[PDB]
Design a protein around this ligand. Structure first.
Ligand SMILES: *[C@@H]1O[C@H](CO)[C@@H](O[C@@H]2O[C@H](CO)[C@@H](O[C@@H]3O[C@H](CO[C@H]4O[C@H](CO)[C@@H](O)[C@H](O)[C@@H]4O[C@@H]4O[C@H](CO)[C@@H](O[C@@H]5O[C@H](CO)[C@H](O)[C@H](O)[C@H]5O)[C@H](O)[C@H]4NC(C)=O)[C@@H](O)[C@H](O[C@H]4O[C@H](CO)[C@@H](O)[C@H](O)[C@@H]4O)[C@@H]3O)[C@H](O)[C@H]2NC(C)=O)[C@H](O)[C@H]1NC(C)=O
Length: 208
């Protein structure tokens, strides 16, 4: 018969105001004979009616994949609300219920350190600026760079690495033309994580 899977939002989506985090309820092994799926959604056991029904997608094995997507509020996900997908389809004797919520664990605030470009990096016409982020739990984090109210995109960020104390660290390296740095322009590292005040912190650096 048909089988159900319930996915959380992408972790970065729950920390970024520029994203809409979604809980996604996927039904597979839906037959061509009985292809209609009914979804009910509950947030902490209270029904809601704003889910999006997606068009069913033909899979290459005599079945449909049927999906319902429920937008969640950033704060609702971060405050631990429980999202329940209830699925119905003639092939099933009774409805399938699945529930998902944010993982538990004691959260820990990242500490953010900016580092000016090295002494080797100077002889070249581009310099890299570093933003070291450490001591954070859980691993879910977003890191961006900006300057003069505008995004800076020439950066690489390591995925989070697990430390022996149970927390995570990473670095982000932004590369920029040396002239911009030598001109006294201010580059900012932005970090979004569930444990920061306002879920958002920023550190700047510029030349002395
Ligand atoms: C007929 O053919 C189809 C496809 O060809 C088959 O369909 C498959 O059925 C399987 C069940 O038998 C099922 O297996 C489970 O898979 C899950 C993992 O699924 C994810 O990863 C897979 C790749 O590894 C993908 O195939 C899936 O698409 C899925 O990817 C996730 O998709 C999310 C939903 O869209 C997506 O989240 C959203 O993404 C958007 C961005 O676009 C937003 O961010 C939004 O907010 C998100 O919510 C994610 O990006 C993505 N996530 C991840 C993590 O990949 C797996 O967990 C599960 O295993 C667990 O459960 C079993 C219990 O059965 C347990 O035993 C295991 O140990 C484990 O705990 C299953 O393996 C397949 O997923 C599914 N494939 C598809 C494409 O639907 C049929 O099975 C075929 N029929 C037959 C008879 O053969």
């Amino acid at each position: 018969g048909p089988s159900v899977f319930l996915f959380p939002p992408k972790p970065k989506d729950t920390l970024m105001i520029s994203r809409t985090p979604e809980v996604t309820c996927v039904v597979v092994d839906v037959s061509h004979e009985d292809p209609e799926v009914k979804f009910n959604w509950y947030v902490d056991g209270v029904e809601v009616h704003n889910a999006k029904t997606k068009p069913r997608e033909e899979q290459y094995n005599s079945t449909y994949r049927v999906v319902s997507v429920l937008t969640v509020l950033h704060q609702d996900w971060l405050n631990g609300k429980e999202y329940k997908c209830k699925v119905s389809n003639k092939a099933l004797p009774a409805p399938i219920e699945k529930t998902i919520s944010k993982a538990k664990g004691q959260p820990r605030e990242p500490q953010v350190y900016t580092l000016p470009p090295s002494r080797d990096e100077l002889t070249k016409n581009q310099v890299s600026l570093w933003c070291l982020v450490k001591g954070f739990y859980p691993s879910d984090i977003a890191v961006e760079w900006e300057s003069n109210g505008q995004p800076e995109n020439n950066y690489k960020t390591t995925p989070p690495v697990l430390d022996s104390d149970g927390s995570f660290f990473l670095y982000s390296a932004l590369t920029v033309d040396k002239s911009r740095w030598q001109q006294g322009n201010v580059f900012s590292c932005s970090v979004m994580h569930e444990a920061l005040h306002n879920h958002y912190t920023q550190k700047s650096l510029s030349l002395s």
